[PDB]
Design a binder for this molecule. Structure first.
Ligand SMILES: O=c1[nH]c2sccc2c2ccccc12
Lengths: 198, 196
């Protein structure tokens, strides 16, 4: 299942691949980022090759493509975090149990932003001892979503009389989504780690 | 999708009531009655949930590789209230649903013995006195003693903080309970409806 443009990992389960500026792969991410963070400068963009996380994500993706039929279930979103979390996220991905309370809470889950500018805030992408900030670029199974609310520990039901048939995620605003919250393991794949500085 | 499953007519979710006196029913019944012979079984249902099964088996193949042996699975019991059954059947075990103690961490708790899950704190009687307990395939893998406030199992060596145990327990020499902290580390295989 592992994508054919990945570096061969020598039967190994994980590695970070440093991208070259000039590559379309680095340049599209750099544009995605700079679209809203042109004040910051990119140190490097690493491709995250996590075999196990990839398989789990892809199983969850196929399931949601079957459940929802003809939907764009997948968005490419940003996640700022501190240096001390990068090793865990790289290995194990996004754990809602670890999530910070967001300044505007639309539920108890893992938050993803549309705009790099939002993830670029010191409150998420916290500067390390050397001034380095860290932002993931994340494939997120947003699926069918609704405006969330602070109490949510799972997405709400589409229909109150069928409690178990859930939305896939929640947003801050369904007509102009700037945030998405995700409540399940293996619903986000951390694809790139952007290291940047002022 | 396993051999003993029955036809679902191209559907991905079915609860299938077992036939008393047949082999599968007799196997699940005995594991319960080992410690719960004073109770009364009203029925045993096989949970056929293709998606949960797939996600579970994926985690199982990852844990067999990572642990370089095939010893990662145990059959354990989960007692729950009637209002949680529809959720568990369709979505499995969610650590975020959280009622009872979390002494060995903030995951989902499973018992070695049915008698443990058979307590009313866990398998809460409804109006009619009906109690509910899952027989659950759990990926216990390599385990350690748990403690309060864990959000994941501990690291196997603090030098490598991301190489984690698969589960925690109350007692490593003779465990009576296991806590798992990740979605798809438990597949609910049977639902036993019974009374005191
Ligand atoms: O069977 C159990 N169900 C539930 S629900 C919250 C905790 C527990 C639990 C804890 C230890 C052993 C079994 C169970």
């Amino acid at each position: 299942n592992l994508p054919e443009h990945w570096t061969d990992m020598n039967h190994q389960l994980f590695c970070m691949v440093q991208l070259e500026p000039g590559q379309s792969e680095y340049n599209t991410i750099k544009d995605k980022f700079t679209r809203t963070c042109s004040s910051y400068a990119i140190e490097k963009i690493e491709r995250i090759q996590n075999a196990f996380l990839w398989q789990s994500y892809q199983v969850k993706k196929r399931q949601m493509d079957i459940k929802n039929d003809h939907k764009n279930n997948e968005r490419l979103l940003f996640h700022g975090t501190d240096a001390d979390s990068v090793p865990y996220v790289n290995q194990h991905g996004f754990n809602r149990s670890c999530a910070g309370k967001n300044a505007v809470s639309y539920g108890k889950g893992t938050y993803f932003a549309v705009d790099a500018s939002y993830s670029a805030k010191d409150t998420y992408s916290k500067p390390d001892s050397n001034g380095r900030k860290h932002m993931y670029v994340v494939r997120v199974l947003t699926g069918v979503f609704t405006k969330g609310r602070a109490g949510l520990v799972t997405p709400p039901p589409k229909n109150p009389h069928n409690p178990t048939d859930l939305f896939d995620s929640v947003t801050n605003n369904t007509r102009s989504p700037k945030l998405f919250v995700v409540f399940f393991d293996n619903q986000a794949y951390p694809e790139y780690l952007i290291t940047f500085t002022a």
